[PDB]
């Protein structure tokens, strides 16, 4: 396989999703809009308090760096002014990484971002645009780009890159780039190659997630 996504699986929470990308498997919940804690009351804004918890061992400093990365992306995805003075806690539990957690975060991160989008779709919280994120590596053997890499391919990386882009006017016009985190050595001609490919490979992923939400929503909402 490639990717699979389901929504609605969890029943006690306002919205939820299960994102699986090959070996990598992230299950997500959005809870809220709910009653703010006083330290997480913000005046005009919805608050975000994101938690990433790894499968193996217990969450550390790493997951805060991930939280920041997630929080960056999610702040213009969720309509902040939609709820003033309410909190939303997004709790992302990793059921399998299937890689090495300290070393590579490429698949882990991309998966969380997508499960967060879906969960928020199920939740009903306003979403301006479609977001997905794809993982891109470069392997040293050919000294070239391999899109959507497996666990083996990640080991033999010299460098690794995630991109996330905001999708409007048919979910197919790139509005903006909400992330481009390019770690390891790159020079510019690769990097604009990673955008280019990146564009088209994202838009496929957007098609697939788009399709999934319609099919799963449609027997629920009927007329």
């Amino acid at each position: 396989m490639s990717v699979q996504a389901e929504i609605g699986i969890l029943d006690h929470v306002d919205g939820s999703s299960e994102f699986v990308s090959q070996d990598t498997k992230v299950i997500c919940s959005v809870t809220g809009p709910i009653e703010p804690k006083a330290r997480q009351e913000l005046p005009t804004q919805l608050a975000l308090e994101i938690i990433v918890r790894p499968a193996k061992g217990v969450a550390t400093t790493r997951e805060k760096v991930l939280e920041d990365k997630l929080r960056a992306v999610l702040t213009p995805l969720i309509t902040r002014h939609c709820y003033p003075r309410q909190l939303c806690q997004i709790t992302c539990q990793i059921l399998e990484s299937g890689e090495d957690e300290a070393e590579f975060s490429l698949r882990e991160l991309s998966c969380c971002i997508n499960a967060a989008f879906l969960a928020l779709v199920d939740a009903g919280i306003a979403l301006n645009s479609m977001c997905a994120s794809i993982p891109i590596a470069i392997i040293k053997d050919t000294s070239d780009i391999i899109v959507d890499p497996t666990a083996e391919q990640l080991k033999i990386s010299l460098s690794v890159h995630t991109l996330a882009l905001e999708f409007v006017n048919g979910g197919k016009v790139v509005k903006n780039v909400l992330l481009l985190d390019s770690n390891g050595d790159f020079n510019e001609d690769q990097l604009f190659s990673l955008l280019e490919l990146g564009e088209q490979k994202c838009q496929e992923l957007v098609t697939n997630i788009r399709r999934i939400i319609q099919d799963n929503i449609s027997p629920r909402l009927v007329v």
Binding site: V58, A59, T60, T61
Partner: protein, 211 residues
């Protein structure tokens, strides 16, 4: 490791091992702080630099308090190693001096956050006794720069591991410390430290006079 901070490999262990002074003052040199001071002391023995920063008056509302309070953090140097408890003692010492010197009645619901950074102490040749003049010089400057009320400038000498702090031109004592000095030093030390206090008094006044 830990959930609040990265501590690397945990079965890993440290490496095993193999007026006579000039105080020159500075203030108002870094910003995000209501006032700051810098004290560097050079002596034959050891050279040292101490940074201080004072934050607030801050409001501490949701409770009414009789008067304000002072809270002292000492932070372990990056080239000096001390037990946490000693830093507590010295924090406690300095608080009780400052309690007596800072006037606290113009400020209801107040907490003041004082930070003492004991950054560099280096020997070319206890130890914690010796840097007490320098801590007291630093912090006073900082309270003055910020606009925090004070009875008199606070300042002290160190004669023979004995520290005596005075205010009012040597007339009143606001604290006394003796730790591993010799029995019956009292007259030598008080005479010797008065000299020291009068000497650093005016230095602080002249730092405050360039602004």
């Amino acid at each position: 490791q830990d959930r609040r901070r990265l501590l690397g490999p945990a079965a890993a262990k440290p490496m095993a091992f193999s007026s006579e002074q000039e105080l020159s003052l500075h203030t108002g040199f870094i910003e995000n702080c209501n006032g700051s001071a810098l004290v560097e002391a050079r002596s034959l023995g050891h050279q040292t630099s101490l940074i201080s920063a004072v934050y607030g008056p801050r409001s501490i509302r949701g409770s009414f308090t009789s008067q304000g309070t002072i809270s002292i953090q000492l932070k372990n140097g990056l080239l000096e190693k001390y037990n946490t408890n000693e830093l507590k003692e010295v924090s406690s010492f300095l608080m009780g001096i400052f309690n007596s010197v800072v006037n606290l009645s113009r400020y209801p619901k107040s907490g003041i956050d004082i930070f003492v950074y004991l950054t560099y102490d280096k020997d070319l040749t206890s130890q914690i006794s010796s840097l007490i003049p320098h801590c007291i010089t630093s912090i006073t400057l900082a309270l003055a720069d910020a606009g925090i009320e004070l009875v008199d400038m606070a300042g002290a000498g160190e004669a023979n591991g004995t520290v005596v702090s005075f205010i009012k031109n040597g007339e009143e004592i606001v604290g006394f410390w003796k730790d591993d000095g010799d029995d019956e030093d009292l007259l030598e030390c008080l005479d010797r430290c008065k000299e020291q206090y009068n000497r650093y008094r005016d230095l602080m006044i002249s730092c405050l006079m360039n602004q």
